[PDB]
Design a protein around this ligand. Structure first.
Ligand SMILES: OC[C@H]1O[C@@](CO)(O[C@H]2O[C@H](CO)[C@@H](O)[C@H](O)[C@H]2O)[C@@H](O)[C@@H]1O
Ligand SMILES: OC[C@H]1O[C@@](CO)(O[C@H]2O[C@H](CO)[C@@H](O)[C@H](O)[C@H]2O)[C@@H](O)[C@@H]1O
Lengths: 97, 94
């Protein structure tokens, strides 16, 4: 092996987010996916049952609801980790009156 | 037949103190992403290979092409703009 890289993510296990926000994690993940998909469809990518760099085919190029549950969980957790980092970095997150 | 329509976040204002920390946020999402692939047997290779589990982005975040860091930063900021658009205050604690 040539490269010796060990990822060390920040410990966000004890960062608490409003329950109201976590209740919306699907809403956030869905929009993240829409942004992702629009960027790939604008580059000529299309849906295909196997990923393919040469023919620009991706299986995840579907509406968010049609994704496998495993893939939605990923998207929801990515979203929550990105926000937990905001809180870890010293910002308050509060639902507006 | 499927047309993505992301929320219009063009007018959502985030505190400048936070946008300054884009790279810290982007760098951590990359670490979590990288940690998950390496735990499943992925390694760095300069071409992506779904078969030998080789990905060119399995490098320290600072070693990424600027185009890739730029993508990660914008992704992080759109996720946080969604929070603000969904009715949440984001303010630095002083
Ligand atoms: O485990 C899947 C992995 O993909 C990520 C990339 O950060 O999500 C992006 O790519 C997905 C398909 O590969 C899209 O469905 C998703 O919308 C997009 O944000 C992570 O969320 C996840 O860890
Ligand atoms: O594939 C690039 C594409 O994936 C995103 C998530 O949608 O970033 C993820 O994948 C990157 C490597 O491909 C990682 O560096 C990053 O941390 C991870 O979240 C997009 O930002 C990017 O356009």
């Amino acid at each position: 092996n040539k490269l010796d890289y060990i990822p060390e993510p920040m410990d966000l296990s004890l960062v608490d987010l409003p329950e109201s926000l976590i209740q919306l994690s699907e809403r956030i993940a869905e929009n993240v996916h829409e942004v992702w998909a629009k960027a790939r469809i604008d580059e000529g990518w299309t849906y295909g049952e196997k990923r393919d760099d040469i023919h620009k085919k991706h299986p995840c190029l579907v509406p968010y609801d049609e994704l496998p549950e495993e893939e939605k969980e990923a998207d929801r957790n990515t979203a929550m980790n990105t926000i937990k980092m905001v809180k870890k970095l010293g910002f308050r997150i509060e639902k507006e009156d």
